[PDB]
Design a protein around this motif. Structure first.
Motif: not given
Ligand code: NCA
Ligand code: NCA
Lengths: 464, 458
Positions: B346-358
Motif C-alpha cells: 500500500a506504499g507505507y513504510a514499516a516505520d508506521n507500525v509495531a506489534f505486540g505478542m502476549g
C-alpha cells in the motif's frame, strides 16, 4: 527467589498508570473471573490458594515502594507513590481487597463467576485492577486441573466397563511426566499440583513440595523406580539383558512395582528369542509387578501389541466383567499421550478384550505445558464501580444479559446446578439455592483454606 | 519461594533411583543438549545462566539430604543418602560437574551441540543425569528467544526495504504483553527476558527484575502509558471522548478501532481532536482491539493518512505525521508478515507500525517446538570411555562432543573433542566453560547477549 519479592512489580507495566484513568469521585471497584468457553464445557477450579500464599506473602513495605518508584520511572511508567505509601502507613501494608471463590476442586460449567475481587477501602479503590496480572494466572492451575479431570472421566468410564475395581485402579492411571517439559520450576510445582487434584501418581517432585507448603499435604503423591533408556543402552548391546536383570535385582520385591523402558522391537524380540526366558523367570520369581514402557512405534498400536505379546508370555486371568487381566505385567504409554490418543488406546485395548486395569498413561508437556489462557478463554473483568456513592454496572456488550454489577455464584440445593447471580438474589432464593462462593481472603488475611484432600473430594464427586 | 529451595528435589522422581542402574565400574558420564528440528532451522541460545544462578544458588547441605531422604522414602523412591553425604562432606556440597555452552545470544543451526554436561568426580559420576530435568527446561528461554529473533528477522527485512533507519526502528517493533497469559511468575520473568534478547519494549516487569538479578542489566527495557478496556467506557459511553482525552492531560498509547477513526474524521468532535493531537505534539500510538489483523492495520493507516498526512522517505514510502499504529491481537510470524506485506504494498513504510505478542510469545511454546533433547553420549567404565547411542545412523552423534565455528565463514558444526586440535587452523571451539564444580565461570551481561543475537542473520 528474592529478586521477585516485590508485589508492586508483579504486574503489567501499564497497570501502574491505571489509577489515573478512573472517573473523579470513584471509591470502589468490583471484578470477577470466569471461563468464557473453550475446549471443555466445565472447569475444575484450583490454585488460587497457592497464588495468594505465594504472591501476597507479607505486607507491602516502604522499601517495596522505593524500589518500584525508581524502576517504573526509569522504565517509563507513572507510579502512585502517595497511594501506596497511604496503604503502608494507614493500612499496615495490607491490601484492602476481599476475594471470594468457589471451593477449590469444584467443577463449574463455563460462563460462571469463579471468583470475585472487591475493594474494601474508599481511597485505595484501585488495588483490585493492580492485581489483575497475578490473579488472572489462575487460568493455569485451573486449566491443568481441568485437563487432568477430563482425562479421569475418560479412564473412569472404561474402568467402570471393564474392571472389577474401577475406583481402586483409577488414581494410578495418569502419571505426570512433565517436569522437564514445562517452562519453569514454579509452573512445574503448581501445574503438577493441579494434576494431583485428580490422581496419585507423579514424577514431578516439585508438586509434592507445593502441596506440602500450600495445601497442608505432607506427601501428596507417589511413584516407583523406573529405568532410563539411555542408562540401559550404556551397558552395551551384549549385556542389554543384564541391565534389565539389574533392575529386577535392585527393585523387584513382592508387592513392589518397577518400570522398565524398551523400544517396541526389543519387546517383540525378547518374547520370541530364547534369551527372554531368563527374564520371564526372574520376573515371575520376584513377586513384583513389572510395568513395561514401550518408547517407539505408533502410540496407539504399540500398546495393543504389547498386551497381546505379554499375554502370550505371561498369561492372563478373566475378571468378573469378562475382560483379560495380565499376570505379573502391566504397560504404561508415555509417548504421544494427550486426551485423544489416550481414549484411542482405551477403545482399542478394550475392543480386543483387555481390561483397562492393564494400562496406564504418562503425560508430560501435553499436561503441564500445551495449555494457554485461551484453552478455557479465561478472563478477569470489571463488573461494577462506585462513583459518588452510587454503584454503576460495567460491561462491554449488553448481550451474550451480560454479567454486570456485584456478582456471586449460586448452587441449586435440589439439583446441584450452578448459576451466576446478583448479590441481591441470594436473599430471595434462600430456600432453593445457596451462595456457592466462600470468602478466602480479606485485608491481608487468608480466611477459608483447603487441604489437598478436601480439594480432591470436591473434584472426585463431580462427574460428566 | 523457600519451599522449593532443595536442589535434591528439583528432579524427576525416578532420577532418585537412577544411580543404581549404571553398569558396574562406571565412573564418568557425558551429556549434550541439542534441538532436533521443529518449527525453525536455527535457535537462539539463551537462559542457561539464569537457570544455573537460580537452581544451583548454594551448596547442598545436610538439612537438604535429611529432607529429601524422608520425602523420597514416603513417596516411593530409593535415595542415595551416602552419595549425597559424600558430596556434602568431601566436596563442600558443590556439584562435581562441568557445563560448557555456546555463548548466550548466538544463533545455531538445529541438530548441533548447544551445551555439554560432564561429571568431574569418579564417585559422584551420576550427578549429570540427576540434573537433566532442571537443565532441559532451558528449552523454554531458548524457544522464546528464538521465536522473538525469528520475528525480528521478518521486521528487519521490511525495514531494510522501506525505512530510512532500519536498525534504529527495529528494537521497538515487537512489544511483550504476555505476563497475564503465561503459567507463572517465574516463567513470566525468564520468558520475558528471552524476548528482551531481541527487543527493548516490554510490559512484563518481571523480566526487568530477572535481567537485573541474573544478567547484570538494571533497566533492560521500556514501555509507555496506555488506556484500557476497563475504565475509558467506564466513564460512561456519553463521555468516552473526554475519557480517552483525559490522558492527553498528563508518547502515549490510545486504544481505538478502525470505525472509530473513521467516525472521528466525519464528525466535528474529531476535527477538534486532530487539533489537540497536533497542538499537543505528542506521538499518539493507536492500538486497534478488533477486526482482522491485516485489514485493520491497513485501514487505520489509510484513515490516519487522511487525517494527519505524511512525508515520503528516502526509499519512497510514506511515513505518517504524529501517529503510529501498534497491532497487539492475533500476531504470529505468519500474520505479522502478512500485515507488513499489505502495508508496504500500500506504499507505507514499516516505520508506521509495531506489534505486540502476549501468550503467543510466552506461553504457546513447548519442548516439542524445537524438539529439544538432552542425551547421554558417553560413559567411562573401568577406566575406558565408550560411546552411548540408540540407533547407529541419522552418522549419529556420540562420544565426548563439542561445537566448532569455522574461522573464515562463521558456520557451526558439531565434532568430537579430538578434532579441535587437528582443525585448529580453520576452526575454533565455540563452546565456553560456564560452570564447574560449584563456580560459575563465563558470565554475560544482557547487552552482550543482545550483541550476539543482533549480529546473527538468516
Ligand atoms: N518415571 C519416568 O519413567 C519418566 C519421568 C519423567 C519423564 N519421562 C519418564
Ligand atoms: N502407574 C505406572 O504404571 C507407572 C509407570 C512408570 C512410572 N510411573 C508410574
Amino acid at each position: 527467589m528474592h529478586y521477585l519479592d516485590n508485589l508492586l512489580l508483579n504486574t503489567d507495566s501499564y497497570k501502574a498508570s491505571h489509577w489515573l484513568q478512573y472517573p473523579p469521585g470513584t471509591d470502589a471497584s468490583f471484578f470477577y473471573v470466569e471461563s468464557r468457553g473453550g475446549v471443555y464445557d466445565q472447569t475444575a477450579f484450583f490454585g488460587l490458594q497457592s497464588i495468594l500464599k505465594e504472591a501476597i506473602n507479607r505486607p507491602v513495605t516502604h522499601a517495596d515502594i522505593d524500589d518500584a518508584k525508581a524502576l517504573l520511572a526509569a522504565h517509563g511508567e507513572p507510579f502512585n507513590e502517595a497511594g501506596w505509601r497511604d496503604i503502608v502507613d494507614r493500612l499496615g501494608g495490607q491490601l484492602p481487597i476481599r476475594i471470594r471463590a468457589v471451593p477449590e476442586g469444584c467443577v463449574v460449567p463455563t460462563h460462571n463467576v469463579l471468583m470475585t475481587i472487591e475493594s474494601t477501602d474508599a481511597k485505595a479503590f484501585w488495588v483490585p485492577s493492580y492485581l489483575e496480572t497475578l490473579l488472572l494466572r489462575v487460568w493455569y492451575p485451573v486449566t491443568v486441573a481441568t485437563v487432568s479431570w477430563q482425562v479421569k472421566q475418560i479412564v473412569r468410564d472404561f474402568l467402570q466397563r471393564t474392571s472389577d475395581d474401577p475406583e481402586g485402579q483409577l488414581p494410578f492411571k495418569l502419571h505426570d511426566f512433565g517436569a522437564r517439559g514445562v517452562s519453569s520450576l514454579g509452573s512445574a510445582a503448581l501445574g503438577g499440583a493441579a494434576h494431583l487434584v485428580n490422581f496419585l501418581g507423579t514424577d514431578t517432585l516439585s508438586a509434592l513440595l507445593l502441596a506440602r507448603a500450600h495445601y497442608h499435604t505432607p506427601v501428596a503423591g507417589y511413584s516407583i523406580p523406573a529405568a532410563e533408556h539411555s542408562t540401559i543402552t550404556s551397558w552395551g548391546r551384549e549385556r542389554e539383558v543384564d541391565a534389565y536383570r539389574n533392575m529386577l535385582t535392585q527393585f523387584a520385591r513382592p508387592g513392589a512395582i518397577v518400570a522398565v523402558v524398551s523400544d517396541s522391537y526389543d519387546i517383540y524380540r525378547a518374547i520370541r528369542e530364547h534369551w527372554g526366558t531368563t527374564l520371564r523367570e526372574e520376573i515371575i520369581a520376584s513377586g513384583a509387578t513389572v510395568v513395561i514402557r514401550p518408547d517407539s512405534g505408533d502410540p496407539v498400536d504399540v500398546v495393543e501389541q504389547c498386551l497381546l505379546l505379554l499375554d502370550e508370555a505371561f498369561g492372563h486371568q478373566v475378571n468378573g466383567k469378562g475382560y483379560k487381566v495380565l499376570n505379573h505385567v502391566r504397560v504404561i504409554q508415555g509417548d504421544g499421550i494427550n486426551p485423544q490418543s489416550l481414549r484411542a488406546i482405551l477403545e482399542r485395548i478394550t475392543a480386543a478384550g483387555y481390561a483397562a486395569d492393564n494400562v496406564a498413561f504418562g503425560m508430560g508437556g501435553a499436561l503441564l505445558q500445551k495449555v494457554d489462557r485461551d484453552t478455557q478463554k479465561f478472563a478477569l473483568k470489571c463488573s461494577a464501580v462506585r462513583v459518588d456513592g452510587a454503584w454503576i454496572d460495567v460491561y462491554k456488550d449488553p448481550i451474550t444479559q451480560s454479567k454486570r454489577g456485584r456478582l456471586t455464584l449460586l448452587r441449586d440445593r435440589a439439583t446441584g446446578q450452578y448459576r451466576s447471580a446478583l448479590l441481591d438474589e441470594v436473599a430471595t432464593h434462600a430456600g432453593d439455592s445457596d451462595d456457592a462462593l466462600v470468602t478466602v481472603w480479606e485485608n491481608g488475611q487468608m480466611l477459608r483454606e483447603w487441604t489437598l484432600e478436601q480439594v480432591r473430594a470436591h473434584a472426585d464427586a463431580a462427574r460428566l
